[PDB]
Amino acid sequence: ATQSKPTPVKPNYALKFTLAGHTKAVSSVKFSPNGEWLASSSADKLIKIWGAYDGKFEKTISGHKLGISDVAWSSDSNLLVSASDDKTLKIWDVSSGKCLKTLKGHSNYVFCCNFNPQSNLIVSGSFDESVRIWDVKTGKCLKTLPAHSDPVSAVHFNRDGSLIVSSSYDGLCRIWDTASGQCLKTLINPPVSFVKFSPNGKYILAATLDNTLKLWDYSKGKCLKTYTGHKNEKYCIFANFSVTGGKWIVSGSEDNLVYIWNLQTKEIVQKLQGHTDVVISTACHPTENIIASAALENDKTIKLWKSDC
């Protein structure tokens, strides 16, 4: 008798549910931190809440005047924030489905948003090329960062909220000190279409519109891993670290597939087939081996896939 380390070579994600309901392109899907829910945003101006395990439709949340690009959960899974083409963000109580606050200040489309781990702040990126930091409790804009010289494609807090990472079509990835709003680091140039901090908080996963994902050690400023084989030259596609089982990288792709790479070897380990348009968003369940994927207007569905590892 001994204790062994399971080292799976590939996952075996298989389609379990397809979720219909949105009437235009789906823009973003996100699992709630408590693992109970999936939230989706769409160009149809709606947010929809679904059961994370069975995909059962739970509710529709409305009030935005134009399409919604992004949604994000608070740490206690009780709030959502949404970024809209109506130039506002909205903070919602998920239980009631009612808008708590409207965050106004951006002068163009709001493309991306996130809570910080404490969930007392919200960070947003916009087509107006700025990154804004908002107080959740008052709804007031605390700071406006002249972050980029093109639309901001992603914003993400690190694990204690002390840092913000942003990316833009201007070709830059920047790291900002949350407290001061000042730039701590710039990495520079094809458009950077997505960025996010790793689960361990030490790395940055960055996508560029040359069909490339890169894992960077941001402090050393060194690229540690690169993942290719998918198609990404036009859209800002969400990517993820999958850490509940084997250590994978997950992304959508413009060839309508979900790509899964071995994080360490960078080999493609799985390709998920089923969507009929660009897989613009993917998300990984916080505790179970479950992936949600969502596609653009020729498809308009969300799919839930499950793996044994």
List of residues contacting ligand Q41 (CB under 6 A): 25, 27-28, 43, 67-70, 85, 111-112, 151, 153-154, 169, 194, 235-236, 238, 280-281, 296
CA distance 147 to 164: 11
From the CA atom positions of the chain, what is the Rg in Å? Answer: 18
- Closest CB to ligand Q41 among 145 and 269? 145
Q: Least distance to ligand Q41 from the beta carbon of 84, Å?
A: 8
- Closest CB to ligand Q41 among 190 and 221? 190
| Nearest residue to the partner ligand Q41, using Cβ | 67
- Closest CB to ligand Q41 among 86 and 136? 86
Assigned token pair, 224: 């540690």
- Closest CB to ligand Q41 among 249 and 269? 249
Q: Least distance to ligand Q41 from the beta carbon of 214, Å?
A: 16
Q: Least distance to ligand Q41 from the beta carbon of 81, Å?
A: 12
Burial of 1 (0-12, 13-18, 19+ CB in 10 A): exposed
Q: Least distance to ligand Q41 from the beta carbon of 124, Å?
A: 11
| 213, amino acid identity | L
- Closest CB to ligand Q41 among 79 and 154? 154
- Closest CB to ligand Q41 among 67 and 246? 67
CA distance 151 to 43: 18
Q: Least distance to ligand Q41 from the beta carbon of 25, Å?
A: 4
Residue 108 DSSP one-character state:
S
In the chain, what are the helix, strand and coil shares in percent, each to the nearest 5?
A: 0, 50, 50
Q: Least distance to ligand Q41 from the beta carbon of 127, Å?
A: 6
| DSSP secondary structure of 215-257 | EEETTTTEEEEEE-SS--SSS---EEEE-SSS-EEEE--TTS-
123's enclosing H/E stretch is strand 121-126
